[PDB]
Write an enzyme that holds these catalytic residues in place. Sequence first.
Site, mmCIF file in Angstrom:
data_model
loop_
_atom_site.group_PDB
_atom_site.id
_atom_site.type_symbol
_atom_site.label_atom_id
_atom_site.label_comp_id
_atom_site.label_asym_id
_atom_site.label_seq_id
_atom_site.Cartn_x
_atom_site.Cartn_y
_atom_site.Cartn_z
ATOM 1 N N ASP A 22 0.861 -1.149 0.000
ATOM 2 C CA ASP A 22 0.000 0.000 0.000
ATOM 3 C C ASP A 22 0.924 1.233 0.000
ATOM 4 O O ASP A 22 1.799 1.349 0.864
ATOM 5 C CB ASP A 22 -0.933 -0.039 1.207
ATOM 6 C CG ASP A 22 -2.059 0.915 1.061
ATOM 7 O OD1 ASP A 22 -1.738 2.110 0.872
ATOM 8 O OD2 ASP A 22 -3.250 0.494 1.107
ATOM 9 N N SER A 64 -7.131 4.596 -0.707
ATOM 10 C CA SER A 64 -6.901 3.139 -0.788
ATOM 11 C C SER A 64 -8.164 2.379 -1.183
ATOM 12 O O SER A 64 -8.087 1.273 -1.746
ATOM 13 C CB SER A 64 -6.342 2.630 0.547
ATOM 14 O OG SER A 64 -5.147 3.321 0.905
ATOM 15 N N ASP A 123 -9.952 -2.377 7.173
ATOM 16 C CA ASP A 123 -9.285 -1.341 6.388
ATOM 17 C C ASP A 123 -9.566 -1.562 4.896
ATOM 18 O O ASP A 123 -9.998 -2.640 4.474
ATOM 19 C CB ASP A 123 -7.770 -1.341 6.664
ATOM 20 C CG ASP A 123 -7.104 0.011 6.405
ATOM 21 O OD1 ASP A 123 -7.805 1.047 6.330
ATOM 22 O OD2 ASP A 123 -5.857 0.031 6.245
ATOM 23 N N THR A 143 -8.131 -1.999 1.960
ATOM 24 C CA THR A 143 -7.562 -2.880 0.975
ATOM 25 C C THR A 143 -8.187 -4.271 1.104
ATOM 26 O O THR A 143 -8.714 -4.763 0.095
ATOM 27 C CB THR A 143 -6.028 -2.894 1.057
ATOM 28 O OG1 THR A 143 -5.542 -1.571 0.985
ATOM 29 C CG2 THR A 143 -5.369 -3.712 -0.051
ATOM 30 N N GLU A 157 -1.542 -8.007 1.496
ATOM 31 C CA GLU A 157 -1.277 -6.585 1.613
ATOM 32 C C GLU A 157 -0.273 -6.288 2.704
ATOM 33 O O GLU A 157 -0.500 -6.587 3.900
ATOM 34 C CB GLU A 157 -2.547 -5.792 1.928
ATOM 35 C CG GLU A 157 -2.251 -4.308 1.862
ATOM 36 C CD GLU A 157 -3.201 -3.421 2.604
ATOM 37 O OE1 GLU A 157 -4.051 -3.902 3.382
ATOM 38 O OE2 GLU A 157 -3.103 -2.182 2.367
ATOM 39 N N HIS A 211 2.712 8.051 5.518
ATOM 40 C CA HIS A 211 1.840 9.115 6.064
ATOM 41 C C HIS A 211 2.481 9.710 7.277
ATOM 42 O O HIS A 211 2.460 10.933 7.411
ATOM 43 C CB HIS A 211 0.437 8.657 6.482
ATOM 44 C CG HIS A 211 -0.522 8.403 5.349
ATOM 45 N ND1 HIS A 211 -1.051 9.413 4.570
ATOM 46 C CD2 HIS A 211 -1.111 7.255 4.923
ATOM 47 C CE1 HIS A 211 -1.910 8.896 3.699
ATOM 48 N NE2 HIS A 211 -1.966 7.585 3.887
ATOM 49 N N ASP A 228 -1.421 0.302 -4.611
ATOM 50 C CA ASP A 228 -2.696 0.997 -4.911
ATOM 51 C C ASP A 228 -2.548 2.429 -5.434
ATOM 52 O O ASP A 228 -3.443 2.955 -6.124
ATOM 53 C CB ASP A 228 -3.629 0.947 -3.683
ATOM 54 C CG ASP A 228 -2.977 1.517 -2.420
ATOM 55 O OD1 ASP A 228 -1.734 1.678 -2.430
ATOM 56 O OD2 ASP A 228 -3.718 1.801 -1.435
ATOM 57 N N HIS A 229 -1.416 3.077 -5.127
ATOM 58 C CA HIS A 229 -1.140 4.447 -5.563
ATOM 59 C C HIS A 229 0.258 4.786 -5.075
ATOM 60 O O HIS A 229 0.847 4.044 -4.262
ATOM 61 C CB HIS A 229 -2.129 5.440 -4.939
ATOM 62 C CG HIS A 229 -2.217 5.284 -3.465
ATOM 63 N ND1 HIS A 229 -1.182 5.648 -2.633
ATOM 64 C CD2 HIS A 229 -3.148 4.697 -2.678
ATOM 65 C CE1 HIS A 229 -1.483 5.307 -1.389
ATOM 66 N NE2 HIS A 229 -2.680 4.769 -1.387
#
Lengths: 445, 445
Positions: A48, A99, A150, A152, A319, A328, A366-367
């Site tokens: 992630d 996400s 969460d 994902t 994941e 973050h 995911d990004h």
Amino acid sequence: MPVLENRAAQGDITAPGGARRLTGDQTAALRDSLSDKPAKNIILLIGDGMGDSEITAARNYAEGAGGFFKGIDALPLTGQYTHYALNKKTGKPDYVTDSAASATAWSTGVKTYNGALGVDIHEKDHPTILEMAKAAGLATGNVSTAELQDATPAALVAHVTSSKCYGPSATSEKCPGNALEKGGKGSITEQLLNARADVTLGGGAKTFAETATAGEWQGKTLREQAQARGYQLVSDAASLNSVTEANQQKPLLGLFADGNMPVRWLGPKATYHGNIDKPAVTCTPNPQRNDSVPTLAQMTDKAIELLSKNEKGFFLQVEGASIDKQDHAANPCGQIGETVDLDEAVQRALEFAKKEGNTLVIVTADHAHASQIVAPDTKAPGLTQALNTKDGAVMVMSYGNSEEDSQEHTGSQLRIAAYGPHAANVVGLTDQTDLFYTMKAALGL
Amino acid sequence: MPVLENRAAQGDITAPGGARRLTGDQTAALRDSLSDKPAKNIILLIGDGMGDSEITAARNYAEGAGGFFKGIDALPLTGQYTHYALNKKTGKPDYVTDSAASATAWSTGVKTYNGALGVDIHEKDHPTILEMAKAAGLATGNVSTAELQDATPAALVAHVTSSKCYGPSATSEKCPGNALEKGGKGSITEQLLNARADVTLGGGAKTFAETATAGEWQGKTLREQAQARGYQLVSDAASLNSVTEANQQKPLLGLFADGNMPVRWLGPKATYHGNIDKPAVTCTPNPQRNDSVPTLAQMTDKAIELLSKNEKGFFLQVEGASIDKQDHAANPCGQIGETVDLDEAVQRALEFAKKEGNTLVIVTADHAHASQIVAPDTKAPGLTQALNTKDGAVMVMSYGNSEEDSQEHTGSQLRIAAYGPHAANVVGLTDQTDLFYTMKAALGL
Ligand SMILES: [Mg+2]
Ligand SMILES: [Mg+2]
Ligand SMILES: [Zn+2]
Ligand SMILES: [Zn+2]
Ligand SMILES: [Zn+2]
Ligand SMILES: [Zn+2]
């Protein structure tokens, strides 16, 4: 079908040819990596927030600049994919996904709005690859280092208008159309239990202490519901290891933490001018993480073991969820440590896929995210940190895109890599929604 | 060998499958993309600083999130490569390269220190791919929107201990070992005139006003020297267009600007809280650019025309240099405009290569950069700007890695893409120095 066995620097990186990762022409090896036979199994691994920057930083620190991730870097077929979401009102692109919308894209094949799980911009439910796998008689697995509610993991099993709808209370408040007592399919946790994957492993034990407001198991905590419905519940490494089977008669639910599972490495948060005024950091093992908590690799191991008993095949998602969370938090040691943790899971997946030979293994994110690799003497406006790498040199990381308490996702296309049947479909430019259609076609669903 | 014809979103990006870039299984097409026959020609296109981020931001703005760069995105074989430099003192990796060290890596196959051109950390000269091409009887082209003394084109033809050594004056001061009067090979410009590529096209007229301090052409300007040595000088689009041959008898030297060539688009500089405080921006064509200044695609075209007359083959490098320069300047419009400029050049390259059939085209970048795509309502500590994209939605870009007046390179691995014979050698994880060896081997050098 070969794995990339060793694309480390082959020599003295200061001499001609010493930094080469290739020892000769690759046309034949790549020819041999291309098969359109059916995939029997798929293993999808998501880091992630694991953009190309996060992969590089992790490699630079853990293995050296010219080093090689025997898991992450070992997949032969590579491309770049796009993960843009949509604005819910306009349906136009929203260039930086969260996400939820991103996981919804590869798991249903429809773009959606930030915060949506398994629904489209019209709030219409769409089937997930896990639901389809199971419908076709395939074994199914859902593994994460995050809370299982969460985004994902939840995207494979829940269809909700906001990803905050973890349990009955949240749902009644934020997703009243999904609330069970309003005639909806229920909270994320309630939907997960209904979906009944064979193997589900992660954190998020705490939401299971809430009680249902309606339905057959009204007035029981969600844990009790799980038990009443035949799930095997495990809570640590030893109890996970003891499990000998997992299926529809005896699905496995592993709950390894109240919330997210603890990360493996400790280091300080990056700070303003951290690379200039604070010493270079060396990461160390996280003392708050008990050995009794299974690793992503250990979770991935058992999942493969149990899922592989299915004659017809399996779908497994895995994941590395805290790459994102530590990015973050502007914490390079946390972030890097979770990239290493994911590399270990990729290794188990490819070793399995290699021996079995009909398994499509995919590795992506995911990004993209915030962290950047910058020059040692950078004077930057955000948070930075100097790190002592495997090479014996300093690497500086920078987190420069938020003045608030959380650094932010970024919208850059990013690496997607694959090994095995149908792996070709990951090469060149694709969209995250293609991954859905790739998996669906590979498995013949 | 096919080129990716159209990997735009195929339908309604709000509906299931509508955001797919693929229309079916790619194993066949990819197989058909793999050939190990000799490359007769190579066209290497470098977007300076054009990391995946830069690609994405430009696609989002110019073509929309689900759009498709008909050049940049149309190469079928893709991977990610590493471009770290070396610390000159230690020989250990320096995780963020400058343009000189990186260009030296692919042009020579040796890693080196930041600021070195065609020399290794010991300051020893190593031959370049263009020099080797020339030696084997092949035509050679070197094209850039930068000053021709700038790092990227210079690395092909100059061996100097500092990329600052543009002409005699800078060289005597900063590379006294290279200074002609001290018995060295000379300044970057003098060595470029000795290298004598068939086609050299860019900016950098300024340094040619310098007079040499020693050697046969002492006291003459470096322009006078070029003419005394049989170079054909062109200075604008019409004069370039009227050239009918370039070879070792009449090498072509195009000098289209005093310094760097003027960028294609104008827009304001990103500012602190710019996405919040300033309206969304739409880029416009740069009204100060004379239409008599050839574009990169126009230079590429002419170079291909002229070089392709050689029966043995050619090597051509083409650099979109100002992606990097505008990224440093935190100017999204200038940056995206230059990425669009590059894509036009890549289309010319691919068009030629598809008809000719024995030409390897490679599109990559020297290193990554600062710019990030962020959520429109981001509050960031650096410089940001909101853009109105082709989608009719707002994109925000952020430049958050320097407090000084130049945004910094970043160390992330980044896309390399290829088409044609030996394009396999770009797939998966490779190093920038592998590109040297790939090119060498493709041309049988
Ligand atoms: Mg996640
Ligand atoms: Mg350059
Ligand atoms: Zn994420
Ligand atoms: Zn996140
Ligand atoms: Zn550069
Ligand atoms: Zn630069």
